[PDB]
Design a protein around this ligand. Structure first.
Ligand SMILES: *C[C@@](C)(O)[C@](*)(O)[C@H](Cc1ccccc1)NC(=O)[C@H](Cc1ccc(OC)cc1)NC(=O)[C@H](C)NC(=O)CN1CCOCC1
Ligand SMILES: *C[C@@](C)(O)[C@](*)(O)[C@H](Cc1ccccc1)NC(=O)[C@H](Cc1ccc(OC)cc1)NC(=O)[C@H](C)NC(=O)CN1CCOCC1
Ligand SMILES: *C[C@@](C)(O)[C@](*)(O)[C@H](Cc1ccccc1)NC(=O)[C@H](Cc1ccc(OC)cc1)NC(=O)[C@H](C)NC(=O)CN1CCOCC1
Ligand SMILES: [Mg+2]
Ligand SMILES: [Mg+2]
Ligand SMILES: [Mg+2]
Ligand SMILES: [Mg+2]
Lengths: 222, 212, 233, 204, 226, 195, 196, 195, 233
């Protein structure tokens, strides 16, 4: 029997700061126990200060991104070059995914950018289009390894103020872009150590009011 | 998920949890499972996350179109029936939805309709819906009376979701609470179970099953 | 949904400093029967692109005709068809990737794995893969089937990363490709000795070599191997 | 149906400087129903600690079996079994049920009383030993524990630091797993004192 | 797993990677897949980890007893015969795939054995998920009349192909060299090409960060005197 | 055999066990006692597959009564519950397992404490302040989490059980035909006759 | 696999390819499928590698014990011992074995034992996946009482074609010659046999 | 939707329909009216698959009410029951059939007779002195074979129904939460409020 | 439980006035492959019985050895082994029927259909069938496999009932058998031209004919048949 789905591995990670957001993904692409590529980008500048990744089955991921990019293009044509806000992108992506509710896009989608007050925004989707805004999300193969670390280190979960018995939580702070990139780099090194489908390279897209910047780092190639 | 809605002397209480699951993986602890359709109408979500968000958001659009065309707020009966007739068209395709449509109109009074994806539509005074419904029912039915104060009814709704959050592996996160009156719905806060459990344990002298 | 009947095995390929090399053997298998011994699975498109195809041969012949018709159609009302508006490797690839994914999405795949090798207008090397699922990827080395498991490890010892491509000559790359084809003949039960090889260079253009053979094979050590364990004679 | 995830639970162990730590959650359920909030998964035979995750009937059975075997060991040898030897005994015992296995993820922790060397080991359900210098994880949130441990851990932590590190690894892994949590216990083990601490954690 | 065996002038060399996996997760980053059967008979293991450990320990135990009984140094063909008969009896259910090698009074030997009980002889062999990546290297670079140094190089190169190109294999390279007339030398972590880079940050928490409900001293000692 | 409940209070253990016996489309009996006295201060309730339940309960009863005669001594509830657990754990790997879940309510005369053990057919044992087998626990555990206090009297325990039975009669689809209630305390085992 | 045994004037010759497959992967390209069960009784193996080894090892043991007690076994006796194992364990084995031997009395003999464990005495026999492609060729080109050089050529040409058409056959062609003179092992590499 | 009964006496038709609505492990409602007035002298009770039941009943109701307005005239119970049958017979060969069983109780004003029709989801129609759908008929048909006489009064019919409901409450495994009873006679349809 | 591998097709037989005839072709099929061309499936036991066997050939060879050992064992401590205490057809049959039914009852059948033809001491003709299920029956004509469908109708035109047996000579019966074998060669895809035939007569004893061939075949009308319908040339 023909199986229309495959699993191309990889992992992705979105974190929001006060006036920026990052979307990171490894650059490895796999099927079964083979490496297809050590550098196949997975995180894309979509226009209007929005970055997007759709991790899982890469063919579905590429189709989805391609359709959203096209959605942005037609949003400009039909609404007088108006900027597509991140909340509006999110809702549009829900309709793209839910359109294929009974033959789903086999991906976990994350978008990142700035909301309409200039604050960092991360939106996160399931394969059929349910979504939520968060400070914080990992998706893909190593999501189960990475998310709990992010719960601990971004939202300070289970951390209390020392000497308060256990009755005052560690207070929530926004993190600087330098502190976020550290958590991203450590998150991916940890995932590379323990997950066979994660490795090769890390590409981070950072979004500020000034635009989209890229950073790249080597990861272990085994 | 655990969601509940009940009718009492002072209106309707609506309480839901905030957990999303992907099997035994906890996908989220912060999901919104209530939709504010209009200032007098609420929808609760249980089942497929996408199914619930998509179709209840769609329901809001159809309710808005009703008031443009008819120059009048949609009835709870009519709103619940738009959703129930919709899911009935999809019956057998695999939609997963358990919802309560809660609201007030002059003609109806405070009203709750249960609507699910097999097409069942029921008017009633008390419903708990989701994987944790039985846990909520146990606490809710034991302490329910028609004539609770607004303060006691809010607490019972909150306490019932907490009960489910504790015992049901697939419920938790926080409790989102609403009160619906003559004048519309009122939000009564998000209550993280991380703090709410221990507070309730100490003040109430309950949860003696736990090492505290 | 179908099942592949007459099939072609690996297609292997790599980038080098000035271009790309691609190769595939000349066999059309019919299950375990080595049925057809003169099948060309490298198909040139213009003088800047070679499409290497593995998997179902009937679907390969369909793709061959799609490409031939694409050239015909690009020439229509196009006075620059042999110049600035000639078909590029990237145009040919995107067309095939579009088709493959549409066909998988209708549950009626073209049962193939495809590598499009070539050189763009600006001299850039092009090397990209697509298969029956519409999955696409690019890398300094690419191979289908058994080639992915045995050729890639060998070809990656030569070009392990993007920075190794300018350091790699056409002589070194062709030798690695020719060696990889021998290893596949040793080890793949649905391979053949006879193969075709194509080089698309930014200076010298398209060179297409037919009727190559795997040569310089080590079999001599076989005479010393006796039994499966304890048997001495 | 899948016996390794009917009841839920997790165990993690870590080495520090002249110390080891081993921790577990307290939940026992039947799939979605949480039944008990006091089901400990860590046992000791003299100074050797054993954590067991998986099917709870097999957790109990194996504890009783290793209590039996180590009691007899001690009577015949006239000394307490050491962690390296007990690790081999766990492996032997699991592998003798090769084709009808105990559905468990055991974890050994302790300090060799002669050499003073900290020791941890993990096993699969049929006895393959994973002897690690850094950490061992087991249970329904093992993916989550691997992620926490791989980022949080650093070598040569002092007992009171190691306690914070292992507790944060456990707590945060448990919170992303439906079938783990409901309480936790952390044993900090030095050559001749062992402190046991119950953690305050979210009760959902 | 990637395991290999290479015959050379005066002996045989075997090598292995050091990764074990549980699904797509790496359970252990530094396992020992080179199992000693007797002092000069070693084998590299692939397949179900517990089965390979149990099968080599059992046959090693029985080889030791046979060696004592006969007053002779054990032969590789005896290890092979016992392994094949045991594995065949279990009809593939004991999932051990082994490269069996060594030196004995008869000379130097190199065999492979599959889970169902079939055996092979060769000058170079590979098994496991990375066996194709390894065999590509062996088929390209092997020659007859190899020196000890050339064979260690070839074997570790073949493992490296597995480490880099196969997702089933990673971390380090282990080697064991069995030369005629000499002690077998086991080279644990002969190559270490995958050391984890320095982390960006320390995650050491402030003492008191974790909320505690209760403490107590655990009694580990025996029952006390007086 | 559907609903069996147990709650342990200050100085007693209360077991409540439904009376219905149902095969297919018919309620064959409405007065079934799903319980056996194992010793004068130990009571076992049981539910599970037809036939297996009584056979298992009576087998355990025979063995504890035998132990009693041989030693002229009553095993502690902890000892009885461990014996039962081992029998179920041995059973689960047999050709045909006993598909029987049990609660064991006992008063330990040596410690002067009531004790309640919940054991499933796999040999999964837990000591609990309150317990239930089958679907009943989906309603009752949350009820008791709210209303239970550890220092309750026997009569407070019975009212707390009325609250449980009322909820099950309201929300469960099956007519289980009420419950037989028994109290285990320092003076032995007695049946509450009006419930 | 492609295997054959051919009787001729001075004795019998066994031939085989050298390919062992694991699906489409070639696990061993220089396999020795001709195995000795007695000094002048040999067999060709096809089917499961594990099954045919286990059988051949047992037969070798039975015939060594026969030899100790009763002297040299006949080729028919060797075939009978293979048959007993193959027939009685037919549910659990996938073994197609050709048994060939030389007596001074009976000269060269060939027995084939296919899947079910029947025995068939023949002037020559072919078996294995690759044999299907040469039934026509072998029937047309076999004569009785060929010379050694003729029989070597007949087998070389036959297995050449089996190898050409069958993907599960390949590598070298091995042969074992069984006459009064003794035991001669031959090998033929692809560069000789392909161009035929 | 489990139990629906109907009995036809001298001058009326009585329909009794259970109040429980149950999904899985929970009774969601205990006051459900499993009935629709089709016309002033015709009542249809229904049971079957969740969703399908109400959708079918309301669809039939819409159509009969439409016929009423168009002709300013009430279809006979025989005519309504034939229409319903045809809809179910058409449905059974569709992509997704209505899985709904019905009883139709009507008073024909032209003949001055009560009439009771039993129709299953296949379009199988029968006129009967008494009828039932689902498992209820396994108890009630034999009961009524014994106790029913054709010339009974409406109040005798209600006692005969009490006897049916008592038996179902005794012997059926499910708690169906009592019945809503309605009488169809020459003066229309009315609900008996205490049962 | 198994499946038959190497197989033999029909065995056909009939009674005539003084004895019985039985025949079977010399083929051992291997699925659709006509693998072995010199297989004897008629096995004489003494000079008064022939056992004809179809189905699995490995199981046939087992039965052959059971019968050979039965003769050996009947000779033991039996000075009348070549006379009054010789094995009869009825003794040989009952033995085989016992075995077949025991084997089916242990879910491990001998995958065969068997006809035991012979002449008893008193001159009575014996002809009885048994198969893998242990089902047994007797009739003036008996045939296995395709023989049951095609041979029996022809042989029954000669001997339609018990009363026709004294009216039927050995010449008439042999001709009917030989004709039936030709019809089976025409129509059974797993048959062969070469066959064996045996006659057991009460006067002349056992005659066993090897290497018979089907002859006098009509193929000539084939040249006039063209296409499948409308094709004239
Ligand atoms: C108790 C719980 C957690 O299940 C409660 O019902 C949640 C309600 C809810 C409402 C709004 C937003 C988020 C969550 N539901 C979930 O968490 C659901 C549970 C569920 C999973 C799958 C199905 O399948 C029919 C039904 C219910 N979780 C999800 O929907 C998760 C996040 N997504 C998926 O499982 C993705 N799959 C993809 C394939 O199509 C089905 C949905
Ligand atoms: C590359 C690899 C990882 O496959 C190589 O073969 C490893 C060899 C090895 C040898 C000695 C010590 C350690 C490692 N093998 C493993 O790491 C195996 C891989 C494997 C998993 C599952 C199956 O299933 C048939 C076969 C091989 N890993 C394990 O054996 C791990 C530790 N245990 C399990 O996955 C649980 N087992 C799986 C088999 O069924 C019993 C439960
Ligand atoms: C044509 C060919 C090459 O297949 C020929 O018959 C080979 C004969 C041979 C090989 C080596 C030594 C001696 C003789 N046979 C093989 O190469 C077999 C093919 C085969 C595999 C499995 C079965 O199972 C019924 C029949 C034939 N190869 C093997 O046996 C290899 C070593 N093992 C496996 O492929 C593992 N098998 C896979 C199927 O399940 C059992 C384990
Ligand atoms: Mg990695
Ligand atoms: Mg948890
Ligand atoms: Mg919970
Ligand atoms: Mg070949």
């Amino acid at each position: 029997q023909f199986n229309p789905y495959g699993d191309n591995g990889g992992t992705i990670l979105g974190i929001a700061g006060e006036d920026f957001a990052v979307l990171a993904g490894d650059t490895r692409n796999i099927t079964d126990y083979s490496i297809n590529s050590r550098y196949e980008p997975k995180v894309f500048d979509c226009g209007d200060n929005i970055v997007m990744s759709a991790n899982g089955f890469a063919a579905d991921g590429d189709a989805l991104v391609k359709r959203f990019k096209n959605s942005v293009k037609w949003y400009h044509f039909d609404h007088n070059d108006k900027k597509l806000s991140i909340n509006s992108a999110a809702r549009n992506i829900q309709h793209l995914l839910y359109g294929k509710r009974f033959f789903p896009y086999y991906v976990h989608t994350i978008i990142a950018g700035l909301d309409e007050d200039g604050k960092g925004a991360v939106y996160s989707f399931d394969p059929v289009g349910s979504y939520e805004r968060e400070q914080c999300r990992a998706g893909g193969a190593a999501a189960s390894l990475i998310m709990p670390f992010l719960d601990n280190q971004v939202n300070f979960k289970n951390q209390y103020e020392p000497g308060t018995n256990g009755k005052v939580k560690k207070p929530l702070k926004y993190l600087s872009v330098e502190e976020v990139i550290k958590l991203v780099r450590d998150s991916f090194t940890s995932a590379t150590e323990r997950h066979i489908q994660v490795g090769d390279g890390l590409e981070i897209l950072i979004v500020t009011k000034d635009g989209v910047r890229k950073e790249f780092y080597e990861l272990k190639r085994d | 998920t655990t969601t509940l809605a009940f009718r009492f002397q002072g209106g309707i209480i609506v309480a839901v949890d905030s957990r999303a699951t992907a099997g035994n993986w906890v996908a989220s602890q912060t999901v919104k499972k209530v939709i504010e359709i209009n200032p007098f109408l609420l929808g609760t979500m249980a089942g497929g996350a996408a199914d619930c968000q998509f179709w209840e958001t769609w329901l809001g659009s159809q309710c808005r179109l009703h008031e443009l065309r008819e120059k009048e707020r949609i009835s709870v009966a009519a709103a619940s029936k738009i959703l129930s007739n919709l899911v009935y068209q999809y019956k057998g395709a695999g939609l997963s939805m358990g919802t309560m449509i809660c609201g007030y109109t002059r003609k109806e009074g405070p009203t709750i309709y249960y609507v699910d994806s097999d097409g069942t539509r029921l008017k009633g005074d008390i419903f708990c819906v989701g994987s944790g419904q039985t846990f909520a029912y146990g606490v809710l039915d034991s302490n329910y009376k028609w004539d609770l104060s607004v303060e006691d009814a809010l607490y019972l709704g909150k306490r019932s979701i907490l009960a489910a959050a504790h015992r049901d592996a697939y419920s938790g996160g926080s409790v989102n609470l609403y009160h619906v009156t003559e004048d519309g719905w009122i939000y009564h806060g998000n209550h993280d179970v991380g703090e709410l459990f221990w507070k309730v344990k100490e003040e109430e002298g309950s949860f003696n099953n736990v090492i505290g | 949904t179908q099942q592949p009947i007459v099939t072609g095995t690996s297609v292997i390929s790599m980038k080098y400093d000035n271009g790309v090399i691609i190769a595939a053997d000349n066999l059309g298998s019919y299950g375990s029967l080595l049925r057809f011994n003169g099948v060309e699975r490298l198909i040139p498109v213009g003088d800047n692109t070679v499409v290497g195809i593995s998997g179902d041969i009937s679907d390969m012949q369909h793709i061959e005709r799609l490409l031939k018709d694409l050239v015909t159609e690009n020439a229509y009302d196009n006075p620059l068809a042999d110049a600035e508006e000639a078909l590029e490797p990237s145009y040919i690839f995107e067309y095939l990737a579009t088709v493959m994914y549409q066909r998988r999405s209708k549950m009626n795949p073209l049962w193939n794995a495809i590598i499009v090798a070539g050189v763009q207008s600006n001299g850039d090397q092009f090397l990209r893969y697509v298969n029956l699922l519409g999955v696409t990827y690019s890398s300094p080395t690419l191979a289908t089937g058994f080639g992915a498991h045995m050729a890639n490890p060998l070809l990656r010892k030569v070009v392990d990363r993007e920075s190794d491509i300018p350091k790699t000559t056409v002589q070194v790359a062709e030798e690695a490709i020719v060696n990889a084809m021998r290893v596949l003949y040793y080890r793949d039960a649905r391979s053949s000795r006879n193969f075709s090889l194509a080089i698309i260079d930014k200076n010298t253009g398209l060179t297409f070599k037919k009727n190559l053979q795997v040569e310089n094979m080590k079999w001599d050590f076989a005479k010393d191997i006796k039994g499966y364990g304890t048997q001495k004679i | 149906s899948d016996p390794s995830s009917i009841n839920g639970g997790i165990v993690v162990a870590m080495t520090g400087k002249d110390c080891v730590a081993i921790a577990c959650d307290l939940r026992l359920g039947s799939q979605s129903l949480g039944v008990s909030n006091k089901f400990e998964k860590i046992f000791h035979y003299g100074h050797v600690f054993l954590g067991i995750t998986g099917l709870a009937t097999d957790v109990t059975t194996l504890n009783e079996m290793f209590r039996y075997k180590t009691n007899l060991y001690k009577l015949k040898e006239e000394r307490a079994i050491e962690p390296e030897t007990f690790t081999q005994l766990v492996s032997s015992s699991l592998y003798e049920r090769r084709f009808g296995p105990y559905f468990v993820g055991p974890v050994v922790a302790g300090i060799n009383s002669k050499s003073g060397k900290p020791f941890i080991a993990g096993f699969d359900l049929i006895g393959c030993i994973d002897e690690a210098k850094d950490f061992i994880v087991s249970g329904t949130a093992s993916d989550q524990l691997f992620g926490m441990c791989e980022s949080l851990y650093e070598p040569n932590l002092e007992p009171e630091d190691l306690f914070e590190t292992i507790s944060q690894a456990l707590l945060n892994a448990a919170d992303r797993d439906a079938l783990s949590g409901w309480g936790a216990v952390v044993y900090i083990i030095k050559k001749d004192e062992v402190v046991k601490r119950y953690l305050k954690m979210r009760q959902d | 797993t990637t395991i290999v065996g290479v015959k050379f002038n005066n002996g045989v060399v075997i090598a292995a990677d050091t990764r074990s996996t549980q699904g797509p997760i790496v359970a252990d980053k530094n396992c020992a897949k080179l199992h000693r059967i007797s002092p000069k008979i070693w084998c590299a293991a692939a397949g179900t980890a517990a089965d390979t450990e149990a099968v080599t320990q059992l046959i090693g135990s029985n080889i030791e007893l046979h060696s004592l009984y006969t007053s002779r140094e054990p032969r590789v063909v005896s290890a092979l015969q016992m392994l094949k008969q045991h594995l065949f009896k279990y009809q593939g259910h004991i999932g051990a795939y082994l490269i069996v090698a060594g030196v004995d009074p008869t000379g130097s030997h190199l065999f492979s054995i599959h889970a169902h009980g079939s055996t092979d002889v060769g000058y170079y062999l590979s098994l496991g998920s990375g066996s194709l990546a390894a065999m590509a290297v062996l088929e390209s670079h092997w020659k007859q009349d190899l020196t000890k140094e050339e064979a260690i190089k070839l074997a570790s190169d073949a493992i490296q192909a597995g480490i880099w190109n196969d997702l089933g294999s990673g971390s380090n390279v282990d080697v064991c060299v069995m030369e005629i007339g000499k002690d077998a030398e086991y080279l644990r972590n002969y190559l270490t090409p995958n050391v984890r880079e320095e982390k960006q940050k320390s995650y050491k928490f402030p003492r008191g960060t974790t909320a505690v409900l209760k403490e107590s001293i655990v009694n580990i000692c025996d029952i006390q005197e007086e | 055999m559907d609903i069996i409940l147990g709650i342990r209070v200050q100085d007693s253990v209360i077991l409540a066990s439904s009376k219905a016996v149902t095969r297919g489309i018919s309620v064959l009996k409405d007065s079934d006692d799903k319980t056996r006295q194992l010793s004068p201060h130990t009571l076992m309730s049981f539910a599970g597959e037809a036939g297996d339940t009584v056979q298992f309960a009576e087998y355990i009863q025979a063995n504890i009564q035998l132990y009693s005669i041989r030693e002229d001594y009553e095993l502690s509830p902890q000892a009885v519950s461990s014996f039962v657990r081992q029998e179920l754990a041995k059973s689960i790997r047999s050709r045909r397992p006993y598909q029987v879940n049990v609660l064991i309510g006992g008063y330990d005369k040596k410690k002067n404490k009531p004790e309640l053990y919940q054991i499933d057919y796999l040999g999964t044992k837990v000591e609990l302040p309150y317990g239930a087998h089958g679907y009943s626990g989906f309603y009752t555990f949350s009820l008791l989490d709210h209303h239970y206090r550890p220092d309750m009297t026997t009569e407070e325990g019975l009212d707390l059980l009325k609250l449980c039975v009322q909820e099950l009669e309201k929300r469960m689809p099956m007519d289980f035909k009420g419950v037989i209630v028994k109290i285990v305390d320092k003076d032995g085992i007695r049946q509450v006759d009006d419930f | 696999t492609s295997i054959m045994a051919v009787t001729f004037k001075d004795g019998v010759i066994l031939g085989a390819d050298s390919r062992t497959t694991t699906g489409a992967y070639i696990a061993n390209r220089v396999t020795d499928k001709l195995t000795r069960v007695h000094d002048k009784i040999w067999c060709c193996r096809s089917g499961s590698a594990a099954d045919t080894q286990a059988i051949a090892d047992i037969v070798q043991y039975h015939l060594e014990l026969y030899t100790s007690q009763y002297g040299t076994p006949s080729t028919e006796t060797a075939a009978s011992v293979f048959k007993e194992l193959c027939y009685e364990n037919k549910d659990n084995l996938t073994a197609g074995i050709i048994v060939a031997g030389y007596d001074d009395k009976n000269k060269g003999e060939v027995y084939t034992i296919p899947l079910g464990g029947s025995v068939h005495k023949l002037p020559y026999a072919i078996a294995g996946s690759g044999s299907t492609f040469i039934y026509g060729y072998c029937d047309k080109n076999f004569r009785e009482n060929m010379s050694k050089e003729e029989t070597v050529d007949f087998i070389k040409h036959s297995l050449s074609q089996a190898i050409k058409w069958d993907g599960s056959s390949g590598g070298v062609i091995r042969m074992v010659v069984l006459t009064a003179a003794g035991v001669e092992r031959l090998i033929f590499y692809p560069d000789e046999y392909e161009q035929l």
